[PDB]
Every structure is written in structure tokens, then in C-alpha cells.
Amino acid sequence: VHLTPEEKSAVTALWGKVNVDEVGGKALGRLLVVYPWTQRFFESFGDLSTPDAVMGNPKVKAHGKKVLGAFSDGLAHLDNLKGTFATLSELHCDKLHVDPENFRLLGNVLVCVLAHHFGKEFTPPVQAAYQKVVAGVANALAHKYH
Amino acid sequence: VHLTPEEKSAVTALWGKVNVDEVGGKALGRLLVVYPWTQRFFESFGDLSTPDAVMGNPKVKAHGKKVLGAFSDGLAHLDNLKGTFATLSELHCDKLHVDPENFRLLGNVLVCVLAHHFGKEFTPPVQAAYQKVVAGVANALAHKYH
Amino acid sequence: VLSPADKTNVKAAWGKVGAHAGEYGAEALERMFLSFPTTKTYFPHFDLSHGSAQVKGHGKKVADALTNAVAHVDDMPNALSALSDLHAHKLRVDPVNFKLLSHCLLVTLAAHLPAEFTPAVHASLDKFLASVSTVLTSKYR
Amino acid sequence: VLSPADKTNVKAAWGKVGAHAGEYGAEALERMFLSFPTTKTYFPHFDLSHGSAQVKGHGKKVADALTNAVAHVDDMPNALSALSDLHAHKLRVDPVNFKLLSHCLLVTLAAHLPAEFTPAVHASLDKFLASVSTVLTSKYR
Numbered sequence: 255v256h257l258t259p260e261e262k263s264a265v266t267a268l269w270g271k272v273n274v275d276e277v278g279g280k281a282l283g284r285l286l287v288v289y290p291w292t293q294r295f296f297e298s299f300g301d302l303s304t305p306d307a308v309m310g311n312p313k314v315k316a317h318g319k320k321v322l323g324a325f326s327d328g329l330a331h332l333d334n335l336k337g338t339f340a341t342l343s344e345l346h347c348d349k350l351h352v353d354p355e356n357f358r359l360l361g362n363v364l365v366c367v368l369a370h371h372f373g374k375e376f377t378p379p380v381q382a383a384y385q386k387v388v389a390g391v392a393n394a395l396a397h398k399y400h
Numbered sequence: 401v402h403l404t405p406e407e408k409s410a411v412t413a414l415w416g417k418v419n420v421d422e423v424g425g426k427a428l429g430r431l432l433v434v435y436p437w438t439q440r441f442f443e444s445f446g447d448l449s450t451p452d453a454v455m456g457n458p459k460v461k462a463h464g465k466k467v468l469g470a471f472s473d474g475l476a477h478l479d480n481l482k483g484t485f486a487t488l489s490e491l492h493c494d495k496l497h498v499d500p501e502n503f504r505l506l507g508n509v510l511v512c513v514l515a516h517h518f519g520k521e522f523t524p525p526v527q528a529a530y531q532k533v534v535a536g537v538a539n540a541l542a543h544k545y546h
Numbered sequence: 547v548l549s550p551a552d553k554t555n556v557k558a559a560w561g562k563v564g565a566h567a568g569e570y571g572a573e574a575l576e577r578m579f580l581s582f583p584t585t586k587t588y589f590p591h592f593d594l595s596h597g598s599a600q601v602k603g604h605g606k607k608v609a610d611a612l613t614n615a616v617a618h619v620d621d622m623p624n625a626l627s628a629l630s631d632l633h634a635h636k637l638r639v640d641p642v643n644f645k646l647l648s649h650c651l652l653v654t655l656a657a658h659l660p661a662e663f664t665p666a667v668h669a670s671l672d673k674f675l676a677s678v679s680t681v682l683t684s685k686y687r
Numbered sequence: 688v689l690s691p692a693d694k695t696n697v698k699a700a701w702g703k704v705g706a707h708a709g710e711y712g713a714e715a716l717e718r719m720f721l722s723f724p725t726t727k728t729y730f731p732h733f734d735l736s737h738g739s740a741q742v743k744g745h746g747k748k749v750a751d752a753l754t755n756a757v758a759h760v761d762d763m764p765n766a767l768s769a770l771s772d773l774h775a776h777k778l779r780v781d782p783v784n785f786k787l788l789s790h791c792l793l794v795t796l797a798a799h800l801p802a803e804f805t806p807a808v809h810a811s812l813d814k815f816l817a818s819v820s821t822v823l824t825s826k827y828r
């Protein structure tokens with residue numbers, strides 16, 4: 255993924271304001287709420303019976319933190335995503351067999367959550383930059399399917 | 401793609417019976433009929449207003465031959481689909497900007513055409529082998545996106 | 547959304563299945579399990595061997611559900627609610643799997659009903675299976 | 688398929704848009720064109736610059752169409768028949784583009800209505816836009 259100097263600056267500036275303990279959980283939680291079948295992969299997380307139960311579930315937040323960490327590491331290695339995400343790709347593709355469309359969905363849910371948190375600051379150009387990022391992460395995770 | 405020795409034999413035996421002059425047109429035609437939006441990429445082709453018009457269209461038949469030829473080229477070098485489709489990938493991706501999902505759709509329509517023509521000879525194991533082939537071709541064609 | 551012609555096409559083509567329901571359903575399932583191995587994870591400890599009595603019995607249920615859908619093609623949600631509860635609420639089946647089974651059902655029909663599987667009917671059957679899939683993967687209670 | 692609660696969520700949420708129709712519709716379009724440049728191929732005759740009057744007017748038409756769909760959430764095929772003909776038979780819009788615009792509409796709503804964009808509302812709106820999309824990409828007469 256290639257970002258212009260302006261895009262990189264804008265992406266980094268927004269990410270700096272991200273609450274690292276909560277944003278990932280809200281992204282994962284919304285994925286589980288908006289696309290319910292994804293819950294099948296998290297049957298050990300306990301109560302996912304209602305939106306409130308999902309969002310307030312400690313395992314969802316804890317795990318969402320790990321997910322966010324992976325996106326953060328991606329931001330610092332945009333030119334080597336397939337290498338950086340190699341282990342995670344084997345995990346999600348060869349072990350868990352997560353259909354790759356779901357990688358695209360989580361990326362877009364993350365974008366919705368960023369828009370939710372930063373409102374007007376999440377301008378169209380800022381969104382465009384982030385779409386390139388989440389598309390890149392999604393592609394890297396789905397590499398074993400390529 | 402990774403077909404077993406038996407699968408490659410099964411695929412090439414059936415392909416040796418595929419009408420080079422018609423099967424491609426039948427697959428392309430059905431693509432245009434079953435997934436109407438694909439017609440937008442073939443306006444110069446003329447009349448694609450009704451199923452009969454599409455299937456009888458000379459340009460659809462002529463173009464279908466080329467499509468079949470590419471699948472044929474893929475079968476001749478299953479260990480280098482990406483290299484074989486390099487030029488075509490740039491065409492469909494960088495030039496035409498055909499959404500990748502459509503590549504999977506055409507592959508599956510081709511599988512339907514093979515089933516329709518061969519009947520009971522197109523067994524589940526034979527289909528399984530062809531699915532690896534069309535998946536590989538679709539992936540190779542979308543390589544400029546990965 | 548199905549057109550009037552789509553409904554006519556589906557009723558005529560699916561109507562030919564008749565007593566072959568179990569056979570065709572089992573074949574579509576076997577095609578799916580062999581072509582797309584990941585789908586077997588939804589049927590743990592199932593006897594998925596060729597000619598399996600368990601698969602033919604299951605194939606009949608799938609086929610009969612489709613006959614049910616045809617008989618209620620203009621009001622499927624209310625006719626397939628029990629299947630929605632099973633596939634969406636309980637099993638949480640990923641939608642991609644429905645695309646795979648739908649494709650295998652089309653392949654099975656093309657292989658058995660040469661005269662019925664015209665390009666137009668093929669188009670109608672695809673839309674029909676896509677609509678059934680949306681209902682079974684949706685939570686609408 | 689939308690649940691009864693989904694329809695209530697959509698009506699409640701879209702009712703908040705009100706006079707911001709054209710504004711939000713225009714923003715969603717700009718977000719789509721910038722984030723997904725390929726979508727621009729459908730508007731080669733448009734001035735797609737920021738603040739474009741053509742984009743603004745078009746955004747209002749898109750938003751008003753959604754308002755109509757919300758008002759006819761129980762019978763969308765009939766209410767959107769003319770738009771279906773335009774997008775499915777005339778324009779032949781690839782369905783992937785509807786997923787992109789729907790996403791951009793959600794991003795727009797989330798950016799303007801933080802309090803209202805709850806997880807439940809987000810889910811209902813996504814299903815609603817998906818249903819509108821299916822109708823507009825379907826040829827049913």
C-alpha cells in the first residue's frame with residue numbers, strides 16, 4: 255500500500271487520537287452485531303446474545319485490542335504487509351478458514367468506527383487513505399487464498 | 401493451482417472433448433444473461449437485449465473462443481497461471497477495471513456449461529478438479545489487485 | 547427480486563425434480579463437500595461418503611425445503627422462518643457457503659435437466675437460490 | 688430480510704436526517720468517488736470536484752429516494768420499480784458499487800450522528816441498504 259506524504263501524515267494524525275483500549279473492541283463488537291454469522295468463530299467468548307451483551311463483553315474488548323494492534327503494526331509496515339501478516343494469514347486462512355470477505359467487512363466496520371469517533375475530522379480524503387490501508391491488510395490476511 | 405495427478409488427467413481428458421468453437425461462447429453468453437451488469441463491458445458487441453440475442457450474437461461467440469483459449473492456456477501450464485495471465489490481468493484490472501468477483505462468476509458459469517453439455521460424465525470429483533482450475537484462473541487474472 | 551417470468555421458470559424447472567428430490571439434493575451436497583472442503587465443518591461426524599444414506603436423507607430435506615420455497619415464492623420469509631432460525635440464529639452459517647451450495651445445485655440441475663437448463667432458466671434459478679439464501683441467512687423475527 | 692425491529696430502527700434513524708438529505712447524500716457520493724475511484728466510471732459526464740453542484744443535486748435525489756424507500760419499507764420493489772429499471776436494465780450497475788455506496792452512506796451517518804449510530808441501528812441500516820441495493824440491481828418487470 256502506497257500513501258502520499260499528505261495521506262501518511264493525515265492517517266498517522268488521526269490514529270494518534272484512537273483510544274487503543276476501546277476502538278478495537280468497538281470494531282470487533284460491531285462486526286459481531288452487524289454480521290452475526292461471524293459469531294461462530296467466537297463461541298468461546300460467552301454471551302453474544304444482544305448488541306449490549308456483545309459490546310460489553312470483556313473478551314470482545316480484550317480481543318479487539320489485539321486486532322487494533324495488528325492494524326497499528328500494519329500502518330508502520332505498509333510496504334511489506336504480506337510479510338508482516340504471514341503468520342496471521344496462515345492462522346485465519348489455513349486454520350480457522352475464515353472466508354476473506356469477512357476481512358473486508360471488519361476493515362470497513364473499523365472505518366465506520368473511526369468516522370463515529372472523529373466525526374468531521376474523518377474527512378473524505380482521510381477516509382480514502384484509510385480504505386487503502388484496510389484493503390491492504392485484508393489482502394495480506396487473505397494471501398493464502400491467492 | 402494444486403491438482404493431484406488424477407485430477408489433472410481428469411481435467412485434460414474432459415477438455416479434449418470441449419468444442420473449441422462453441423463452449424466459450426456459451427459460457428460468455430450465459431455470463432451476460434445470468435449476470436446482466438456484465439453486459440456493460442460489451443456495448444460494442446451489439447444486440448444483447450434478450451437471451452436468444454445474446455447466445456446467437458456472433459461477437460459473443462467469437463469472443464467466447466478467445467476466453468476458452470485462455471482457459472486452455474491455463475490448463476497447459478497449471479504451475480504458472482500468474483505468468484500466463486499477466487498481460488490479461490493488466491487488461492481486466494488496470495484498464496477495464498472489471499470487479500474481481502466477476503472472474504469467479506465466469507469460472508462458475510463455465511463449470512455449469514460443462515455440466516450441461518457432459519451430463520453424468522461431469523461427476524462430483526471431476527467438478528472438484530475444475531473448481532481448482534477456475535479458482536486458479538480467476539486468482540491469476542486478479543493478480544494485479546493482490 | 548424475482549420477476550413473473552423468473553417464478554414461471556423456477557416452478558417449471560424445479561417441478562421436474564419430483565421423486566428425484568433426495569438424489570439431486572444428495573448430489574448437490576456431495577459436489578459441495580468435494581469441491582469446497584471447508585463446508586464439511588458444518589457437518590461434523592457426518593457420514594459424508596459417496597452414496598451415504600445420511601447424505602441422501604439430508605439431501606431430500608434440502609430439496610423439499612426448496613419445493614416449499616417454490617410453493618411460497620412470493621412470501622418466502624414466512625414460509626422459511628424455521629430454516630432461518632436454524633441457519634441464521636443457531637448454526638450461524640457464513641453466507642459464502644450458500645453461494646457454494648447454490649452453485650452446486652445449479653450444476654446438479656444442469657447435469658440432469660438438459661432441456662430445462664436454458665440460459666433464461668439458469669438466470670431465474672440463480673436468482674431464486676440467491677433469494678432463498680438471503681432468507682436463510684437473515685434474522686427477521 | 689428486515690426484522691420488525693430493523694424497520695423501526697431505520698425509520699427512527701433516517702428520520703434524523705431530515706433537512707440534511709442532500710448534504711448527506713452529497714457527502715456519501717464524494718466519499719465513494721474519492722475512496723473508490725472505479726465508481727466514477729458511471730458518472731463520466733459529471734463534474735466530480737469537491738463542492739460540485741452536479742454532485743450536490745444528485746446527492747439530494749439519492750437521499751430523497753432512500754426517504755421514499757423508508758416510507759415504503761414493506762413494499763420496496765413496487766415503490767422503487769422505476770429506479771430498478773434505471774440501475775438494472777439501463778445503467779447495468781455492477782452490484783459491488785452498491786456495497787461501496789452503502790458503506791459510504793454509513794460512514795457519513797456515523798460522522799454526523801454519533802449518538803444515534805448505535806450498534807443496533809448500524810446493523811439495521813446496513814440490512815436496509817443491502818435490501819434497497821438488491822431491489823435496484825434486480826430486473827423484475
Ligand code: HEM
Binds near residue numbers: 295345391
Ligand atoms: C481483517 C482484520 C483482522 C485482523 C487484523 C485480525 C487480527 C487477529 C489477531 C492479531 C489475532 C491473534 C493472533 C494470536 O493470538 O495467535 C486474531 C485471532 C483470531 N481472529 Fe482475527 N483478525 C482479523 C479478522 C478476523 C475475522 C474477519 C475473523 C472472523 C470473523 C477473525 C477471527 C479470529 C479468531 C477466531 C481468532 C482466534 C481467537 C481466539 O483466540 O480464540 N479475525 N485475529
Ligand code: HEM
Binds near residue numbers: 466471506
Ligand atoms: C476469469 C475469466 C476470464 C478470462 C479467462 C478472460 C479472457 C479474456 C481474453 C483472452 C480477452 C482478449 C484479449 C485480447 O485478445 O487482447 C479478454 C477481453 C475482454 N474481457 Fe475478459 N476474461 C475473463 C473474464 C472477464 C470478465 C468477468 C469480464 C467482465 C464482466 C471481462 C471483460 C472483458 C472485456 C471488456 C474484454 C475486451 C473485449 C474487447 O475486445 O472489446 N472478462 N478477456
Ligand code: HEM
Binds near residue numbers: 611647
Ligand atoms: C439452498 C439452501 C439451503 C437449504 C434450502 C437448506 C435446508 C435445510 C433443511 C431443510 C435442514 C433440515 C431441518 C431439520 O431437519 O431440522 C437443514 C439443516 C442443516 N443445514 Fe441447511 N440448507 C441450505 C444451505 C445450507 C448451507 C450452505 C449449509 C452450510 C454449509 C447448511 C448447513 C446445515 C446444517 C449443519 C444443518 C443441520 C444438519 C444436522 O441435522 O445435523 N445448510 N438445512
Ligand code: HEM
Binds near residue numbers: 784
Ligand atoms: C442506495 C442506492 C442508490 C440509490 C437510492 C440511487 C438513487 C438514484 C436516483 C434517485 C437517481 C436519479 C433518477 C432520476 O432522477 O432520473 C439515480 C441516478 C443514477 N445512479 Fe443511482 N442510486 C443508488 C446507487 C447507485 C450506484 C451504486 C451507482 C453506481 C456507482 C449509481 C449510478 C447512477 C447513475 C449513473 C445515475 C444517472 C445519473 C445521471 O446521469 O444523472 N447509483 N440514482
Ligand SMILES: [C-]#N
Binds near residue numbers: 321
Ligand atoms: C480477530 N478478530
Ligand SMILES: [C-]#N
Binds near residue numbers: 428463467
Ligand atoms: C472475456 N470475456
Ligand SMILES: [C-]#N
Binds near residue numbers: 608
Ligand atoms: C442443508 N445443508
Ligand SMILES: [C-]#N
Binds near residue numbers: 749
Ligand atoms: C446515484 N447514486
